[PDB]
């Protein structure tokens, strides 16, 4: 027997690499930093071990979604002049949207440096902090200056495909019962992933991909209460947003070529912004979640859903973006139930204009007012739960870390490095 | 035609029919991320071609050498390697014997390089 | 000496004696432009060298192969191909069949790679 | 084992047994500068491998050729070149005759390409 | 005899390339971007022609050190609102006679976190930082040339050793001769993966924290008979120098804008004492005796060697400018170079602190070094000198400096970058069949 060298053997090792974007009005995650797309090959008898919790595509996608966010905010207005003293009065002076607003008057710079401009705007009470018609100031003014969300770029997520470079392959687990870890009997080599919409949300995985046959529970260590549980639905739960107000965006020229878009007036339906989830559909979806959740804790255990414990408004609420305006919904009527072995649910949502999105300090963003009435149709395709540390297990909604949102889309994918040079014995002998 | 990595689960005998399928797929600040991945693929490919060249195997997908198969690396008979195992299983068995084999192939070629160079002057 | 691309208007027979001239000229903000063009020149060169390797033509400029000419790709005889046409005129004629021949050359070498491999086992 | 450039001071005969050591080390503010250093290493390596292929020495470290040694280049005998001189001393002697030798090897192989092309035609 | 082509021959030639960094809280000379390190092969029978005065590693390191400097001063505060009229009085509260009218207690109106509001703040500024305009009205010394970027408070100025490593196809040749004078054939050459840890210590008139000679004091000049060329001395034994800033400065944060803070000297807790450096008198006199001994080999045994203090010029070139602890000292070395040589006690060098720092000799680029809380002590090694000779049987040598490339020429003198030329052709009895 003699050593014979084979070049091109189908052998791969696990690897971490830089996957390039691909996609098929400018966007935050635009197509100017991506590549046009064009595929899937079934690898029979191949049983690969996946790990959705130590996947580097999740860590890289988090970096890239952040990077495309900042890259889309540099070329537009920085609101340094908006740190002035505000003389704010109430809008209603008495349940409505107008009880959430302060009518703030301030001196603003003009396009001519030596001239001022007495203007006013309606600021949400969540954006103004009192100084001790009282005197207020914008909330993120002692920490940073808010680069205005540029009005011509949309926040709508477009699907992005992460494609492996040459010498690498993306392995896709086609198993329908694959939780997040261990062998996957059915594997495929895709050129690159399905369109992953970077939907940014907390406590609820809006839009995205459904499970195939049954609700899937995915935790790094189900016995550890410090680990989030990524529930994935099989049938989506439709959630409808609204801001009933007919907003009136107003433009203020704060400098040469720079405009500040302000809420000048609010008329129309002044009901508080809310989201509606069907009460029958949500009840049967939690029934499926509970059924798949007793498999890890016992048949006789009591599964109780409570509401978020505490913390920032971005972590205690179903924070999300819808129609360019950022909502923060309570979701305390969604998660309120105890499970023993036409109607709708209305979630009161607050709205903010000053956004510190990626759990960072020092880089805020001022989301300008959206003219008109905002309406919203989304699919709740998952959950992020945390368990409380007795025969009763309490599951509060979780979140905060944006990586668990994209870990729910990149759980089935894996990047490998092709090792095409292999040696093996054969009856050969070089002449 | 199975496609790229299609014969990953096939036996070592059947997976060797399609070495050219994997061979051709090893070669082809946001610009730098794409650009640095392209350079990594090129230098990763060239290091494998350089290894084949110094073993006297350049330009060949299947190359026969003059290094006898020491049974310490694997004592399984030829019938239970090319018709029972896959290439992924094989790579895990001779993973620790890979580097010592690589040195032997390098030492076998430069011995043939000088022996043929000497014989060519006669 | 004619120079780079100098024999572009020369007949196919005359232009095939100057292949080394064109072969050596395929390899050699505003910093990535220079850098990304260099990486693309290296990648393109390696793609054509890889193709020659999997056809058994590695390290050769003129490589006679075992693939027969079908005459459905070109019915012209050798006299009117190597003494009347140029390589640009010829390229526009078999452009349709280029990928048909490129597949036959790869398949022929792979069969020839094992027939020689099985011959050494005796 | 001497290491990289270990036989730089050794004689030409002794330093020719360690060509693999130097060969394998020619391939592999801190951003693009480090990235364009890798692309330069690949381009420098690829243009040296291209020269070997043009001279018919692809995939070889010691390549005996057909071009006779013009005594004008170096009148020294083999005994005092391969046993008394080092490669750095030798490179200094023939640094000006390098380019004329390179053209001689380039055309000699081009003659051999057509000579074997005509022999195979029979 | 026929031409035989050999690939991989050990042949090189002089070349210039972009060596990449490697290194074994952020730093100015960022080691996060530098690749981790891992190595040395002795080259018997190899004699190589070195030249430390035409070495391109020094020119490249100067560009890299400057580039790593101003790229670390991009993200942090630009002190353009600090160009205002300061109404400064003198600190006379507990000042020693030496440090009399050297700190000025300057009050000014600053911008607040709120654009429309104003802020009346005070700070202590060194006399070297403020210039009077006609309590008196002063303004910062660099407000008619440029606005000054505050040195970022979390980045560190401490030199971290860096390794300049050659790319593939290049080699770094290291001269292992122990009496190499920087130029000429080095008979003991070795190939290294890349250079030792070269700390980018910025200094003047004294090479601090450098590398010591192996056998004796090494004198290195481009042309020893040319006075216009600086003379680089290298010590075989170090002369430790103890730095100090006795003042207990208090750092005060002034909020000058949204997300921006300006760090101002609040008040010294105690008596005002002058910063100084101590060099052992016995050790320094011993070292100068060794320096003179090897300095007579180029000027004669009967030559009178005289050491004088700096001829004149900028404060950065007339003083032992350096930095340690984050504060930039400008020490007066007229006590180190004062002697004439013919055929327990300590030397105290009164230093002066400065805060607006322009160090790469680039007019238009500042850096405001924020005050360092507490008391600064610092112990370095004087491992060399940068001397200059005056234009008779008496030679006068004065400390030099300014050009920062001489500080790094004293570390990269033994290194050389070569390009491997592996394609060689030689006659042989071969004939291709
Ligand atoms: C020459 O090298 C010496 C040591 O090799 C340098 O002295 C050291 O400088 C660093 C940075 O200033 C000191 O670290 C600091 O220590 C203080 C007190 O422990 C601490 O509060 C700081 O947070 C920081 O960790 C280090 O202690 C000091 N070592 C001594 C004095 O023995 C010296 O600065 C160098 N001189 C140059 C580069 O000019
Ligand atoms: C806008 O600026 C004007 C001045 O240009 C402010 O009016 C002054 O308010 C102060 C009290 O803080 C009075 O002492 C002055 O007499 C006022 N000047 C006038 C009326 O000409 C006004 O308050 C500012 N508006 C804001 C900050 O909303
Ligand atoms: C910026 O100002 C806000 C508002 O004053 C600060 O947040 C407050 O911090 C105090 C002290 O812990 C709390 O009692 C308040 O409830 C906080 N207010 C809000 C709205 O959260 C914040 O700490 C300041 N940031 C900095 C860097 O100074
Ligand atoms: C989830 O997906 C739906 C459907 O794409 C999104 O709703 C669309 O939003 C865009 C932009 O606001 C509108 O132009 C479409 O008309 C909407 N479609 C429907 C059916 O209403 C929704 O915004 C997504 N949810 C997010 C991003 O949280
Ligand atoms: C979210 O909903 C909860 C529940 O409706 C609100 O908080 C509690 O409301 C019940 C009755 O509705 C009270 O008995 C509790 O005292 C409330 N707890 C509080 C106010 O801490 C809550 O106000 C809603 N909104 C938010 C932002 O939590
Ligand atoms: C800081 O600002 C105050 C108020 O503007 C200055 O005090 C005034 O200065 C003007 C100068 O024209 C005098 O006419 C006033 O009498 C001063 N007092 C008041 C109450 O206005 C002060 O001089 C400024 N400080 C600095 C360092 O410029
Ligand atoms: C910026 O201002 C400084 C301070 O006046 C100038 O430096 C002075 O130049 C005069 C010459 O007219 C000298 O007499 C002074 O001694 C200098 N001051 C110091 C502290 O040395 C400097 O020239 C000015 N620079 C520019 C570009 O205008
Ligand atoms: C430098 O040396 C001086 C003395 O020349 C030191 O000052 C003395 O410090 C000691 C304490 O160790 C006191 O007892 C003396 O009274 C001081 N003398 C004078 C004249 O001040 C000084 O501390 C040294 N500085 C260092 C070592 O950094
Ligand atoms: C260089 O040394 C000379 C002499 O030691 C310094 O000049 C004199 O120093 C004395 C010290 O007491 C002063 O009283 C004189 O006024 C100085 N003379 C002049 C003309 O200034 C000189 O200052 C030193 N220079 C440096 C850069 O150290
Ligand atoms: C000053 O130089 C001395 C002498 O080189 C240094 O002390 C020696 O450092 C070497 C290198 O690590 C050690 O091997 C020796 O054991 C040390 N000797 C002693 C007596 O400690 C010293 O570290 C240098 N100081 C500074 C601050 O650079
Ligand atoms: C403004 O509204 C707040 C909260 O709604 C209330 O506490 C305050 O009294 C109001 N100010 C008035 C009515 O002047
Ligand atoms: C996920 O499934 C695999 C295979 O069934 C199993 O080994 C693993 O334990 C599961 N994950 C957890 C957290 O139990
Ligand atoms: C939510 O339901 C309420 C009644 O329950 C209705 O008035 C409101 O219009 C609904 N909003 C949306 C967005 O469906
Ligand atoms: C959401 O709105 C759609 C129409 O946009 C409607 O058909 C559906 O019934 C609504 N569902 C809920 C839960 O409000
Ligand atoms: C959760 O609900 C309780 C009452 O049920 C409420 O007091 C608390 O504020 C809620 N926490 C949230 C919404 O984060
Ligand atoms: C929700 O999902 C359904 C299919 O499950 C789809 O038809 C509908 O358009 C989705 N709604 C969205 C994305 O708003
Ligand atoms: C998987 O194994 C079966 C027999 O066990 C074989 O027929 C099939 O070809 C294998 N898969 C591939 C892709 O070769
Ligand atoms: C095979 O390898 C072993 C080491 O595991 C060695 O002892 C033995 O001599 C080798 N057989 C040979 C060289 O024939
Ligand atoms: C062009 O054609 C003529 C004859 O038609 C031929 O002599 C000449 O060599 C050709 N040009 C080149 C560059 O070969
Ligand atoms: C030539 O090509 C045709 C299809 O275009 C094919 O049918 C025929 O068999 C080929 N000729 C030969 C000799 O294979
Ligand atoms: C250096 O030259 C001497 C001269 O005979 C030789 O013996 C020795 O082996 C040489 N060293 C190397 C490393 O070749
Ligand atoms: C040998 O070289 C000389 C010049 O050194 C040249 O004139 C002569 O023609 C060459 N001979 C051959 C056969 O190439
Ligand atoms: C401070 O003292 C110095 C030196 O005595 C003097 O020149 C200056 O005028 C004094 N300034 C003030 C404001 O008293
Ligand atoms: C500077 O003046 C301020 C005035 O409030 C005083 O508090 C401070 O102590 C003074 N500093 C010194 C040491 O002169
Ligand atoms: C350095 O040494 C070389 C070789 O001995 C000599 O040629 C040169 O003049 C010396 N340089 C100085 C400045 O002495
Ligand atoms: C410097 O301080 C050290 C202690 O850190 C001491 O051992 C040494 O003697 C001092 N050198 C002087 C004062 O010259
Ligand atoms: C430095 O000290 C010496 C001696 O004390 C003195 O002559 C000289 O003037 C001082 N330097 C300056 C700039 O005053």
GROMACS .gro file of N, CA, C and O in nm, chain E residues 91-156:
model
  264
  888UNK      N    1  -0.142   8.167   4.051
  888UNK     CA    2  -0.137   8.082   4.173
  888UNK      C    3  -0.017   8.130   4.255
  888UNK      O    4   0.095   8.125   4.202
  889UNK      N    5  -0.043   8.180   4.376
  889UNK     CA    6   0.062   8.217   4.474
  889UNK      C    7   0.029   8.143   4.603
  889UNK      O    8   0.098   8.165   4.704
  890UNK      N    9  -0.073   8.058   4.596
  890UNK     CA   10  -0.121   7.975   4.709
  890UNK      C   11  -0.028   7.855   4.725
  890UNK      O   12  -0.053   7.752   4.660
  891UNK      N   13   0.077   7.873   4.807
  891UNK     CA   14   0.168   7.768   4.860
  891UNK      C   15   0.276   7.738   4.756
  891UNK      O   16   0.326   7.624   4.753
  892UNK      N   17   0.312   7.837   4.674
  892UNK     CA   18   0.408   7.810   4.563
  892UNK      C   19   0.551   7.823   4.618
  892UNK      O   20   0.577   7.914   4.698
  893UNK      N   21   0.639   7.731   4.578
  893UNK     CA   22   0.781   7.747   4.603
  893UNK      C   23   0.838   7.857   4.513
  893UNK      O   24   0.774   7.901   4.417
  894UNK      N   25   0.959   7.902   4.546
  894UNK     CA   26   1.019   8.011   4.471
  894UNK      C   27   1.048   7.970   4.327
  894UNK      O   28   1.035   8.051   4.235
  895UNK      N   29   1.087   7.844   4.306
  895UNK     CA   30   1.117   7.797   4.171
  895UNK      C   31   0.994   7.801   4.082
  895UNK      O   32   1.000   7.848   3.968
  896UNK      N   33   0.881   7.753   4.133
  896UNK     CA   34   0.757   7.748   4.056
  896UNK      C   35   0.670   7.870   4.085
  896UNK      O   36   0.556   7.860   4.129
  897UNK      N   37   0.725   7.988   4.055
  897UNK     CA   38   0.659   8.117   4.087
  897UNK      C   39   0.609   8.182   3.958
  897UNK      O   40   0.693   8.215   3.873
  898UNK      N   41   0.477   8.199   3.946
  898UNK     CA   42   0.415   8.244   3.820
  898UNK      C   43   0.433   8.142   3.710
  898UNK      O   44   0.475   8.181   3.601
  899UNK      N   45   0.404   8.015   3.739
  899UNK     CA   46   0.416   7.905   3.640
  899UNK      C   47   0.279   7.840   3.625
  899UNK      O   48   0.246   7.799   3.515
  900UNK      N   49   0.200   7.835   3.731
  900UNK     CA   50   0.057   7.801   3.716
  900UNK      C   51  -0.024   7.930   3.726
  900UNK      O   52   0.012   8.017   3.806
  901UNK      N   53  -0.126   7.943   3.641
  901UNK     CA   54  -0.215   8.060   3.630
  901UNK      C   55  -0.357   8.010   3.654
  901UNK      O   56  -0.391   7.909   3.595
  902UNK      N   57  -0.435   8.075   3.740
  902UNK     CA   58  -0.572   8.032   3.777
  902UNK      C   59  -0.672   8.106   3.688
  902UNK      O   60  -0.718   8.213   3.728
  903UNK      N   61  -0.706   8.046   3.574
  903UNK     CA   62  -0.779   8.109   3.466
  903UNK      C   63  -0.927   8.075   3.474
  903UNK      O   64  -0.963   7.957   3.483
  904UNK      N   65  -1.012   8.177   3.470
  904UNK     CA   66  -1.157   8.161   3.469
  904UNK      C   67  -1.212   8.208   3.335
  904UNK      O   68  -1.163   8.306   3.278
  905UNK      N   69  -1.314   8.139   3.286
  905UNK     CA   70  -1.368   8.168   3.154
  905UNK      C   71  -1.511   8.120   3.147
  905UNK      O   72  -1.558   8.044   3.232
  906UNK      N   73  -1.582   8.165   3.044
  906UNK     CA   74  -1.719   8.124   3.017
  906UNK      C   75  -1.718   8.013   2.913
  906UNK      O   76  -1.670   8.033   2.801
  907UNK      N   77  -1.771   7.897   2.950
  907UNK     CA   78  -1.778   7.784   2.859
  907UNK      C   79  -1.921   7.757   2.817
  907UNK      O   80  -2.017   7.798   2.882
  908UNK      N   81  -1.934   7.687   2.705
  908UNK     CA   82  -2.065   7.641   2.662
  908UNK      C   83  -2.112   7.527   2.752
  908UNK      O   84  -2.033   7.449   2.804
  909UNK      N   85  -2.243   7.520   2.771
  909UNK     CA   86  -2.305   7.421   2.857
  909UNK      C   87  -2.354   7.306   2.769
  909UNK      O   88  -2.347   7.312   2.646
  910UNK      N   89  -2.402   7.198   2.833
  910UNK     CA   90  -2.472   7.094   2.760
  910UNK      C   91  -2.589   7.150   2.681
  910UNK      O   92  -2.624   7.096   2.576
  911UNK      N   93  -2.649   7.259   2.730
  911UNK     CA   94  -2.758   7.328   2.662
  911UNK      C   95  -2.698   7.443   2.582
  911UNK      O   96  -2.621   7.522   2.636
  912UNK      N   97  -2.735   7.452   2.454
  912UNK     CA   98  -2.670   7.547   2.365
  912UNK      C   99  -2.688   7.691   2.411
  912UNK      O  100  -2.593   7.770   2.407
  913UNK      N  101  -2.808   7.727   2.455
  913UNK     CA  102  -2.836   7.867   2.487
  913UNK      C  103  -2.775   7.910   2.620
  913UNK      O  104  -2.751   8.029   2.640
  914UNK      N  105  -2.751   7.817   2.712
  914UNK     CA  106  -2.701   7.853   2.844
  914UNK      C  107  -2.549   7.868   2.842
  914UNK      O  108  -2.479   7.817   2.755
  915UNK      N  109  -2.499   7.940   2.942
  915UNK     CA  110  -2.358   7.970   2.957
  915UNK      C  111  -2.309   7.918   3.091
  915UNK      O  112  -2.387   7.895   3.184
  916UNK      N  113  -2.177   7.900   3.102
  916UNK     CA  114  -2.116   7.833   3.216
  916UNK      C  115  -1.988   7.906   3.253
  916UNK      O  116  -1.898   7.918   3.170
  917UNK      N  117  -1.980   7.953   3.377
  917UNK     CA  118  -1.863   8.024   3.428
  917UNK      C  119  -1.776   7.925   3.504
  917UNK      O  120  -1.810   7.885   3.616
  918UNK      N  121  -1.664   7.886   3.445
  918UNK     CA  122  -1.576   7.786   3.502
  918UNK      C  123  -1.435   7.843   3.514
  918UNK      O  124  -1.399   7.940   3.449
  919UNK      N  125  -1.356   7.780   3.601
  919UNK     CA  126  -1.217   7.817   3.619
  919UNK      C  127  -1.130   7.692   3.607
  919UNK      O  128  -1.177   7.580   3.629
  920UNK      N  129  -1.004   7.713   3.572
  920UNK     CA  130  -0.910   7.603   3.560
  920UNK      C  131  -0.769   7.657   3.580
  920UNK      O  132  -0.745   7.777   3.566
  921UNK      N  133  -0.678   7.567   3.614
  921UNK     CA  134  -0.538   7.602   3.632
  921UNK      C  135  -0.462   7.567   3.505
  921UNK      O  136  -0.462   7.451   3.461
  922UNK      N  137  -0.399   7.667   3.445
  922UNK     CA  138  -0.323   7.651   3.322
  922UNK      C  139  -0.178   7.685   3.349
  922UNK      O  140  -0.148   7.779   3.422
  923UNK      N  141  -0.088   7.606   3.291
  923UNK     CA  142   0.054   7.637   3.302
  923UNK      C  143   0.086   7.762   3.221
  923UNK      O  144   0.020   7.793   3.122
  924UNK      N  145   0.189   7.834   3.265
  924UNK     CA  146   0.227   7.956   3.194
  924UNK      C  147   0.270   7.926   3.051
  924UNK      O  148   0.257   8.012   2.963
  925UNK      N  149   0.319   7.805   3.025
  925UNK     CA  150   0.361   7.766   2.891
  925UNK      C  151   0.243   7.745   2.797
  925UNK      O  152   0.265   7.733   2.676
  926UNK      N  153   0.120   7.741   2.849
  926UNK     CA  154   0.003   7.715   2.767
  926UNK      C  155  -0.076   7.839   2.732
  926UNK      O  156  -0.154   7.836   2.636
  927UNK      N  157  -0.059   7.948   2.805
  927UNK     CA  158  -0.140   8.069   2.788
  927UNK      C  159  -0.049   8.184   2.749
  927UNK      O  160   0.064   8.194   2.797
  928UNK      N  161  -0.097   8.268   2.658
  928UNK     CA  162  -0.027   8.389   2.618
  928UNK      C  163  -0.117   8.508   2.645
  928UNK      O  164  -0.238   8.503   2.621
  929UNK      N  165  -0.058   8.615   2.698
  929UNK     CA  166  -0.135   8.734   2.731
  929UNK      C  167  -0.176   8.809   2.605
  929UNK      O  168  -0.103   8.812   2.506
  930UNK      N  169  -0.295   8.868   2.610
  930UNK     CA  170  -0.347   8.951   2.501
  930UNK      C  171  -0.373   9.090   2.555
  930UNK      O  172  -0.437   9.106   2.660
  931UNK      N  173  -0.322   9.191   2.486
  931UNK     CA  174  -0.340   9.330   2.526
  931UNK      C  175  -0.415   9.408   2.419
  931UNK      O  176  -0.519   9.364   2.370
  932UNK      N  177  -0.726   9.137   3.727
  932UNK     CA  178  -0.675   9.019   3.658
  932UNK      C  179  -0.660   9.043   3.508
  932UNK      O  180  -0.743   9.111   3.447
  933UNK      N  181  -0.555   8.988   3.450
  933UNK     CA  182  -0.522   9.010   3.311
  933UNK      C  183  -0.586   8.904   3.222
  933UNK      O  184  -0.618   8.794   3.266
  934UNK      N  185  -0.605   8.940   3.095
  934UNK     CA  186  -0.670   8.852   2.999
  934UNK      C  187  -0.566   8.772   2.923
  934UNK      O  188  -0.471   8.829   2.867
  935UNK      N  189  -0.579   8.640   2.924
  935UNK     CA  190  -0.487   8.551   2.850
  935UNK      C  191  -0.570   8.471   2.750
  935UNK      O  192  -0.691   8.483   2.752
  936UNK      N  193  -0.504   8.394   2.665
  936UNK     CA  194  -0.566   8.296   2.576
  936UNK      C  195  -0.466   8.185   2.552
  936UNK      O  196  -0.346   8.202   2.571
  937UNK      N  197  -0.518   8.069   2.512
  937UNK     CA  198  -0.433   7.952   2.496
  937UNK      C  199  -0.329   7.975   2.387
  937UNK      O  200  -0.355   8.043   2.287
  938UNK      N  201  -0.211   7.917   2.407
  938UNK     CA  202  -0.097   7.947   2.321
  938UNK      C  203  -0.122   7.909   2.176
  938UNK      O  204  -0.065   7.969   2.086
  939UNK      N  205  -0.208   7.810   2.151
  939UNK     CA  206  -0.241   7.768   2.015
  939UNK      C  207  -0.390   7.790   1.996
  939UNK      O  208  -0.471   7.697   2.008
  940UNK      N  209  -0.426   7.914   1.965
  940UNK     CA  210  -0.559   7.952   1.919
  940UNK      C  211  -0.553   8.042   1.798
  940UNK      O  212  -0.658   8.079   1.744
  941UNK      N  213  -0.434   8.081   1.754
  941UNK     CA  214  -0.415   8.150   1.628
  941UNK      C  215  -0.349   8.062   1.523
  941UNK      O  216  -0.324   8.108   1.412
  942UNK      N  217  -0.321   7.936   1.556
  942UNK     CA  218  -0.267   7.839   1.462
  942UNK      C  219  -0.363   7.725   1.433
  942UNK      O  220  -0.374   7.683   1.318
  943UNK      N  221  -0.432   7.674   1.534
  943UNK     CA  222  -0.528   7.565   1.516
  943UNK      C  223  -0.605   7.547   1.646
  943UNK      O  224  -0.569   7.601   1.750
  944UNK      N  225  -0.712   7.469   1.637
  944UNK     CA  226  -0.783   7.420   1.755
  944UNK      C  227  -0.723   7.287   1.796
  944UNK      O  228  -0.674   7.211   1.713
  945UNK      N  229  -0.727   7.259   1.925
  945UNK     CA  230  -0.650   7.150   1.983
  945UNK      C  231  -0.741   7.036   2.026
  945UNK      O  232  -0.842   7.059   2.093
  946UNK      N  233  -0.705   6.915   1.986
  946UNK     CA  234  -0.783   6.795   2.017
  946UNK      C  235  -0.745   6.744   2.155
  946UNK      O  236  -0.628   6.712   2.179
  947UNK      N  237  -0.842   6.737   2.245
  947UNK     CA  238  -0.815   6.683   2.377
  947UNK      C  239  -0.768   6.538   2.365
  947UNK      O  240  -0.832   6.457   2.298
  948UNK      N  241  -0.658   6.507   2.432
  948UNK     CA  242  -0.612   6.369   2.437
  948UNK      C  243  -0.717   6.284   2.506
  948UNK      O  244  -0.764   6.318   2.615
  949UNK      N  245  -0.756   6.176   2.441
  949UNK     CA  246  -0.870   6.099   2.486
  949UNK      C  247  -0.835   6.033   2.619
  949UNK      O  248  -0.725   5.978   2.633
  950UNK      N  249  -0.923   6.039   2.719
  950UNK     CA  250  -0.880   6.001   2.855
  950UNK      C  251  -0.862   5.852   2.876
  950UNK      O  252  -0.797   5.812   2.973
  951UNK      N  253  -0.918   5.768   2.789
  951UNK     CA  254  -0.906   5.624   2.804
  951UNK      C  255  -0.794   5.563   2.722
  951UNK      O  256  -0.755   5.448   2.748
  952UNK      N  257  -0.740   5.635   2.624
  952UNK     CA  258  -0.628   5.584   2.546
  952UNK      C  259  -0.499   5.611   2.623
  952UNK      O  260  -0.486   5.709   2.696
  953UNK      N  261  -0.403   5.521   2.607
  953UNK     CA  262  -0.280   5.523   2.684
  953UNK      C  263  -0.163   5.564   2.596
  953UNK      O  264  -0.150   5.518   2.482
   0.00000   0.00000   0.00000
